[PDB]
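Notes continue from the previous slide.

Worked example: a multi-chain complex. Inputs as given:
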Amino acid sequence: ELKRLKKEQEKIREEIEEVKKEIEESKKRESQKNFILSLQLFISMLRLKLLWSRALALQLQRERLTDTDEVDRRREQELKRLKKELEKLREETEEVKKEIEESKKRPSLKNIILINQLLILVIRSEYLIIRNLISQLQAQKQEQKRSKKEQEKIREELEEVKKEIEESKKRPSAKNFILMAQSLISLIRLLALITRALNLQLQKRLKKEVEKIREEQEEVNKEIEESKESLKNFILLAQLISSMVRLWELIIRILQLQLQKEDELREELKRLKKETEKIREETEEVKKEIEESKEIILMLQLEIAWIRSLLSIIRLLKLQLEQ
Amino acid sequence: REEELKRLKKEQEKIREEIEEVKKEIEESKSESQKNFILSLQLFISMLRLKLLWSRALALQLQRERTDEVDRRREQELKRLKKELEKLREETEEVKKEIEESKKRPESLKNIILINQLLILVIRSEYLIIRNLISQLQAQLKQEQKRSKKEQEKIREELEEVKKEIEESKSAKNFILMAQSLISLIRLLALITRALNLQLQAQELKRLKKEVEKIREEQEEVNKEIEESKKRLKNFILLAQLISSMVRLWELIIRILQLQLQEDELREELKRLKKETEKIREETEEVKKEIEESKKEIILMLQLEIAWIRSLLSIIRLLKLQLE
């Protein structure tokens, strides 16, 4: 079955490269900067999901057969391949990252920068999720410490960022930044708990910290629907993140049950299995809502790929439920 | 002009007999593995003869742009190439069968068999490109585009066919490095045809740039994997570096095509090719040294690999000379 998904990764990698190559042709030719600058992070996120998709396929086939290690053999080599693709974004992240710094040292537009920082803050964190999990397959402590110190370096950036937001959220359209910003803030806050979980897979309170994120993002999503021209494509962008939040809350929800792994965990299974569909449904509802919308030109391409890459993981995740 | 293109179209001969001697020796030498390795020599031999023709068909296109006799000479060589073109596609079908016979006999050689299956499809895809070039020269006709597009999808399914039986099996680490280096090269050749056919229609070429950049990265995945297999059979590795340079060369061919399509935006990506052409020339002679250094199919393998280096370099020059 999995090799069916192992085609879309190329198919998603397609518009990645051209819209990545369409980016720097016009990077030759203050707003258009950070419009270009944002799309690049979207791509660095798009590839990040493809890495995470291949990572999930590894665990899935890790469990399909594990009598001896010819399953592990095909694994350790691919473990290096995706380990590299991590750093190929780590460099690409650097480029955009420093083009955002010196973009601040210049005289709506001022708040676009903040979302990009938030965007980076998300990429920095999904990173360590992968690096953790990527290494948790060479073992089958030279990995724990880096995320502990780094989980501080994101939380320290995340603090200063969120304070420079409420400073203007109290102030006098672009209020839809607030939602996407708030949605990203909840995403980082939610993703911070997942690193606590992935390192617990190595070396309980988060189930309550999750419910804090849940009911808080629930109110952004309600406002999201209470708002559905120019910014109307930007609300769709926000509903994208909303699924990423709900998807990630779904991921940790799997991260408990296998710890407790003899029946009542098949009820949490059925629970997952439905909300597995519920996001993928709400995701494909977005897919139609994206399709309708006809720099903008290039944004909608990545979103479709952002959808497809997300669906491939959901399609790949519901198979982890059979596990 | 001809002085340059004569001292080039003399090295073409200087290679052709080194092939036909390896050739006359092949059937002279002709267990199962031995007669299987013999096949790969012929396939490699045919690959070489395809290169010389490919270079010969190029120099034509040059003098063309460079006299009544630049048109009388047209008919002359184009037929001479078309003859050699079809003589090539002959011998291939026979080898294709002899492998189809050996597959049914069970046995690490199924590696060596699988690579032979790829080489055929590589040869098969290269054919339609040379014809796309030669027929474009004698066109100086709607179905000639289509048979190339038709025999393309015929190779396409056989690629995935053989691609299945690759994963359905997966030292051996290198066979796949080499096998993947070929699959990519095949996926590259299919682009050039669809790119060439796009020339006759004259904005779809955006789909090409995508897939081209796709095959850029994945090739550099195998390219880097090859690099560390040297630091830890040596003949097998340098031969895999032969294939990787082909993917680079053909990448440049495609890059030349998409530029041949559509004044500093021109000169921008233009000198990139001329700069890229300079890179491939030395990389080729890098493989040349290690073959020339590393001194019974082995020697036949070597002289074949050397002649390929010399043959490829002649194409690099015409490409550089074409870039003006």
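Summary box: DSSP finds ten helices and no strands in chain A. The interface with chain B takes residues 3, 10, 13-15, 17-18, 21, 74, 77, 81, 84 of chain A (CB under 8 Å).
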